[PDB]
Amino acid sequence: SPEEQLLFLYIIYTVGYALSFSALVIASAILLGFRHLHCTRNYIHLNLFASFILRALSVFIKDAALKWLSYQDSLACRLVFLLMQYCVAANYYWLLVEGVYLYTLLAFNIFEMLRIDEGLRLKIYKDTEGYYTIGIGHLLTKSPSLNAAKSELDKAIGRNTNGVITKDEAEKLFNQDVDAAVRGILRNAKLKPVYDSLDAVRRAALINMVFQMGETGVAGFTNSLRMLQQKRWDEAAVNLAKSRWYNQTPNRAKRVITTFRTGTWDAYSEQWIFRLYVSIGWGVPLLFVVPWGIVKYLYEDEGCWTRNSNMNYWLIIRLPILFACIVNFLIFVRVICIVVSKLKANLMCKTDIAFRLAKSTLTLIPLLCTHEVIFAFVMDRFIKLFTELSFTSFQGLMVAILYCFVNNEVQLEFRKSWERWRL
Numbered sequence: 001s002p003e004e005q006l007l008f009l010y011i012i013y014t015v016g017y018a019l020s021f022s023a024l025v026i027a028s029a030i031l032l033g034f035r036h037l038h039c040t041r042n043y044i045h046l047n048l049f050a051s052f053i054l055r056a057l058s059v060f061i062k063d064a065a066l067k068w069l070s071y072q073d074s075l076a077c078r079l080v081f082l083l084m085q086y087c088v089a090a091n092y093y094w095l096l097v098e099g100v101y102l103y104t105l106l107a108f109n110i111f112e113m114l115r116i117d118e119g120l121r122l123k124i125y126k127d128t129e130g131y132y133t134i135g136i137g138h139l140l141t142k143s144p145s146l147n148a149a150k151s152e153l154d155k156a157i158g159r160n161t162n163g164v165i166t167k168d169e170a171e172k173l174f175n176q177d178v179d180a181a182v183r184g185i186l187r188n189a190k191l192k193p194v195y196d197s198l199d200a201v202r203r204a205a206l207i208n209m210v211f212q213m214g215e216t217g218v219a220g221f222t223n224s225l226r227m228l229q230q231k232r233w234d235e236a237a238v239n240l241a242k243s244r245w246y247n248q249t250p251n252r253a254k255r256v257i258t259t260f261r262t263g264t265w266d267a268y269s270e271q272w273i274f275r276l277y278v279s280i281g282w283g284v285p286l287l288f289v290v291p292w293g294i295v296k297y298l299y300e301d302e303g304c305w306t307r308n309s310n311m312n313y314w315l316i317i318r319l320p321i322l323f324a325c326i327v328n329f330l331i332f333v334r335v336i337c338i339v340v341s342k343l344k345a346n347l348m349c350k351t352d353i354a355f356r357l358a359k360s361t362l363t364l365i366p367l368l369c370t371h372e373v374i375f376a377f378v379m380d381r382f383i384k385l386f387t388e389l390s391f392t393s394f395q396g397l398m399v400a401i402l403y404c405f406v407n408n409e410v411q412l413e414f415r416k417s418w419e420r421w422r423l
């Protein structure tokens, strides 16, 4: 039947958005309620969820307005459609920042953490404690003799130093120190079990302290290292503040304790970038959705602007989206070589967060952007393409599923608090 087909697809679409909405609100509720989940990654997700929830709201509003001059002629419809188009470009751009965040998350490592903490020197300097340092955090000897420090550096660099050392030579010695730091952990009976129980990020947190103090020194934190292995992050955090290390160099300590406490790079994460992401996810939409809304109100106003087929004015919401998809696929491309390397190199297990996120993210990029890309310059078997409307509807649900319900972290939060109820 013709009428029966058109009605059944409508059912699946609305229950798609009903289930989507419900699930995404529950998920955002979870990310917001549990304190441990308060990190930049999940904040980006909450923005993404918002874009999907708001899209859902538009769907439900349009539907309620069917209930009693017609609705297609009204201006309130054209407004709800502009809100929905904004959400759609917000979906695709919070996905672009979801892609960018993932890329940089793969690009930040210990080498970028220690370049931030330790600084860079070109010439040899006599530090406060008495050690001559140069390069990135490379202490030479405490022996109070600049002549002998320059020589001690010359054997450690090969050619004659003179005092000034080039950027490439410093990066070479920096690599040397970091290999030495990880070997020092693994050659340490108290640091290896905890290091092998830590995830890559908290691993880099441990490496950092070794780079500053040394293997035999951070081993001293017996009180803290035990509760780090027992996965009790917050109880160790307050314990590491009560340290000599925290009172000696506190700005460095706070960053590293936060990295133990959270498991993210957020304490090495400039506060202005999260801005520029909330700006690109929500802002740049506003940079091509509203001038569309104008040419559509001015030059193409016909039945809530659905009869969108005349002239260039279709392109200017499809090209910016098209452009995001292109990159999101370039990103999609580059990322995978990244992950193949990092898993081949054993640099990145499958238990880690950068990988878990590429699982999610790299799924959604094509599942969202692929259709966009195929029919790249098409403007417009009929019961077949109807099924695209079932995918989009459930899109919202899928995100929640992928970005909260199957996410390991939140499941640990649930079990942890039921246990707090029993005890």
Ligand SMILES: CC1(C)CC([C@@H](Nc2ccc(-n3cnc(C(F)(F)F)c3)nc2)c2ccc(C(=O)NCCC(=O)O)cc2)C1
Residues within 6 Å of the ligand: 336, 339, 340, 356, 357, 358, 359, 360, 362, 363, 402, 403, 406, 407, 408, 409
């Ligand atoms: C509808 C589906 C069947 C498709 C979806 C599926 N997508 C997906 C799965 C795997 C790869 N993949 C593997 N290797 C590479 C490579 F090449 F190395 F990069 C990529 N790519 C894409 C998926 C399944 C499982 C998860 C998952 O457990 N999430 C929890 C992780 C977390 O959030 O904490 C996520 C996504 C689910």
